[PDB]
Amino acid sequence: RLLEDALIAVRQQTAMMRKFLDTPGKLMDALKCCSTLVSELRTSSLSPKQYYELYMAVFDALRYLSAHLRENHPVNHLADLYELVQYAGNIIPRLYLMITVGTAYMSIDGAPVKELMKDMMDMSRGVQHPVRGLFLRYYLSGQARDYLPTGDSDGPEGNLQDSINFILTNFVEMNKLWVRLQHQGHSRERDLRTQERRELQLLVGSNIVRLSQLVDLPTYRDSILGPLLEQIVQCRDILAQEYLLEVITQVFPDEYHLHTLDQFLGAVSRLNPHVNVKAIVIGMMNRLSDYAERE
Template sequence: MQSSIADGVPSTEEQEKWLADALALVQHHAFYMHRALDNNNLRDALKFSAQMLAELRTSKLSPQKYYELYMKTFDELRMLEVFFREETKRGCTNAYLYELVQHAGNILPRLYLLCTVGSVYIKSKDAPAKEVLKDLVEMCRGIQHPIRGLFLRSYLSQISKDKLPDAASEFEGEGGTVVDAVEFVIQNFTEMNKLWVRMQHQAVL
């Protein structure tokens, strides 16, 4: 006998509980991440930030509830980005950081960390913006779950919007051209559109 449609739809109370549990774990891991940041402990900062970001792997939350979880981790990633910039001032190269975060255990935390370091990498101009952006937009294809993929690409858009090699941008020239900037935006948008269609098809909305 088939279950009714309602049987497969989580209640509001269930959604609230799942979200509360996830937010509590994000806060827990963020606490230890902050401690590592204060101690300039790069390894622990990466470990606890990856554990924090692992909460975004959930498939239990609706897009609306997932957004709340995403915004909490987004705020924490801002702090991590500042830490990465400070690490480069202490002698750690952007290339090393970019390589190091790719060893994070799970692909979703790895890509969030990679985008965060990538933002610092582009800002430093140690590598051409077009090359880093091309790398990031391609690697984000590793997430094909519609909700997780959409929010990841939204994050990529957020961290890159002021770092495109656009006309009159500080990154134009050695960092790329307007054509490179347009190609990046279109490619990321195209991938987001595919995920959006998939989400509607799966009736996630």
């Protein structure tokens, strides 16, 4: 009931936001309708699938908003708009708006991109509710996907370290939330929570894919696997260990792994026997066997 009624309200708000978006100087009214739409996300009675689908509808409206802002800056501006959008009363609409305006700022002015990422990354320290913070940070990852300062940068200030910091910090905060999915909510929903974690694993692994479309082999050895191994060895969780290690193996190349083999094997030595290390080890060892038989 709630999900479809919310989706109806979302479609109504998208219609009113776009009718406002057509008129310059209705941007604040468009943001008010967008906030009213994201208010639908204040229900928590939706299933993970239902809450996800509502997120998709609000995300789709946000795609319209993000293109509208990335057009408003190219045509006139609104001064201090990143600050001005932080006056929104609803926090989830406000932060989704913060990501949307942020990406508009990265598109309009490349010089503050590095500075804007430090501000935006710092403010992502708010939403610690795993489902809402994960969906918000997924929106962040999709909006902030293409702007990272590095050796693969876009022409903002920034070196390989700024992208490495952005992705590692984003990985650690989302992984902390993703594990917290194991915990958040109520205790009799552990299987539902594990379902939620499997659903949101792509949100975490998008960071690893983004890292692989980032810094190279010496940077991989010093400043990727090290952090990654520290998390792998220190989580003592099972679902995260299998997912995160397989994503590392697949996403980064084995030329990179070969330069990190000893780091890998020093992770291989601490495997906790009551952690379902057997499944992780068989799948990794089988992969290395298959690696061997690509003969």
